[PDB]
């Protein structure tokens, strides 16, 4: 299957004397592995998964220096945007970036990503060709022209096709055992009267990674109506939780089954209300 | 390793 690396960066300007807050988070296959935060007592990139302990001090020092450069880049970019949009001095504004690569199991780049948002709206993005830009509004046309003129896409392309790919591959080799780790969901169904109707709620607890699917069915057909799902949520101890519910007739509860699909399981779980 | 931006916006 594929693999991915992403860096998600945010800079938030602050109306008083403070410089913008700058945070950068790296992910490999959607697992956080490094983080930098300008508000930390000692602002530096830090490992966030145990396999990043293979990197020497040079790695951390130079990545930290890179973040310090990004911090200035974001500061200037925020100030420039303030002018482009004619915004007043004493507000707070958010610039975000997503960058990275998707890599096949043959180590071929499938897609590179380099895009930005301002105030929660898409701003500019590098096209799939890694050569041209899509700009969302008037301000972003200014940026687009500046980057076309300076040849910025060529430099991003080099990062995406070279460094992004090569480092992802190194991280996957060092992180393999950790990246394969799973914790299986523990599941059960609860019963909650609701008018001759009851809510059946199928719980999945203590699972890792977060990816999971819960389904309800009746008489071999998967349900969609009368259904409620909560967003998958952290327990706070590194594992996750989720539930899914259906509203059913009083007296027919046992006819309904919940299925839990998760990569940790040797096969999907099937369960029923069992009072 | 992280990306690094070139020209400012």
């Amino acid at each position, epitope marked *: 299957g594929p693999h991915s690396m992403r860096y998600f960066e945010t800079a938030v300007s602050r109306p008083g004397l403070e410089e913008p807050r700058y945070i950068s988070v790296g992910y490999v296959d959607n697992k956080e592995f490094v983080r930098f935060d300008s508000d930390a007592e000692n602002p530096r990139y830090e490992p966030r998964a145990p396999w990043m302990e293979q990197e020497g001090p040079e790695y951390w020092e*130079r990545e930290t220096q890179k973040a310090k450069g990004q911090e*200035q880049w974001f500061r200037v970019s925020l100030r420039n945007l303030l002018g482009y949009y004619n915004q007043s001095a004493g507000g707070s504004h958010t610039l975000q970036q997503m960058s990275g690569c998707d890599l096949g199991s043959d180590w071929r780049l499938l897609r590179g990503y380099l895009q930005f948002a301002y105030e929660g709206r898409d701003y500019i993005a590098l096209n799939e060709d890694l050569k041209t830009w899509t700009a969302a509004d008037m301000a972003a046309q200014i940026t687009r022209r500046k980057w076309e003129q300076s040849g910025a896409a060529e430099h991003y392309k080099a990062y995406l096709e070279g460094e992004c790919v090569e480092w992802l591959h190194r991280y996957l080799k060092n992180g393999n055992a950790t990246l394969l780790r799973t914790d299986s969901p523990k599941a059960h169904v609860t019963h909650h009267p609701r008018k001759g109707e009851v809510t059946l709620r199928c719980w999945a607890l203590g699972f890792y990674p977060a990816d999971i699917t819960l389904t309800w069915q009746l008489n071999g057909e998967e349900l969609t109506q009368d259904m409620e799902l909560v967003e998958t949520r952290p327990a706070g101890d590194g594992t996750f939780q989720k539930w899914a519910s259906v509203v059913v007739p009083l007296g027919k509860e046992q006819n309904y089954t919940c299925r839990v699909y998760h990569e940790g399981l040797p096969e999907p779980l099937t369960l029923r209300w069992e009072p | 390793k992280a990306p690094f931006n070139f020209a400012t916006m």
Partner: T-cell receptor
Amino acid sequence: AVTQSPRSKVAVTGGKVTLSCHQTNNHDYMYWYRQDTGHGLRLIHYSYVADSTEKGDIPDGYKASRPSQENFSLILELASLSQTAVYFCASSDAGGRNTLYFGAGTRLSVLE
Amino acid sequence: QVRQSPQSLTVWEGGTTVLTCSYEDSTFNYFPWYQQFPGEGPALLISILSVSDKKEDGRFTTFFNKREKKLSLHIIDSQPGDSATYFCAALYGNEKITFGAGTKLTIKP
């Protein structure tokens, strides 16, 4: 544009010297470099934003001032014979790999 | 970290000038050359990324050799107006540029 002032300076040992640089690039980064008998470009001080400065590789004997975005000055409080050299100011955009735009240089001789 | 020799070089007008540089840090991935005429400041001449072997612009070609950590600048049909000091330079990522000591080139007939 990046323009330096003066074009040339002759100072006495122990005298005060200020070299000035003015840029119209609206660039956040400014730099002062030293060149010796036409070789090298050694970074003395630089600045990432108006109203602050950072030590470069060879700061000793020099100070810097960034009073505005457009201006960056190099200050020698007690000029020494060893500071006879040519000094170049530059600007650049913030970020990575942004081209340095240099001024035309200031030649300094420090005399007894 | 960036080693540039010789200090000065003369080559005949019409000849091809070969300027070379080496570097220590194998992670360096951007290599701009700057040209500096007498009485003037340096200015960007040509640059190359480590993904490429060469970059050509008119009479000037830079070649990059990752295995040997070597760069060079070739100038075809070298002419008097190419007389200048050439600085090789190198950096990784968004780190600050490191310049070589510069080679002073004189083109003579």
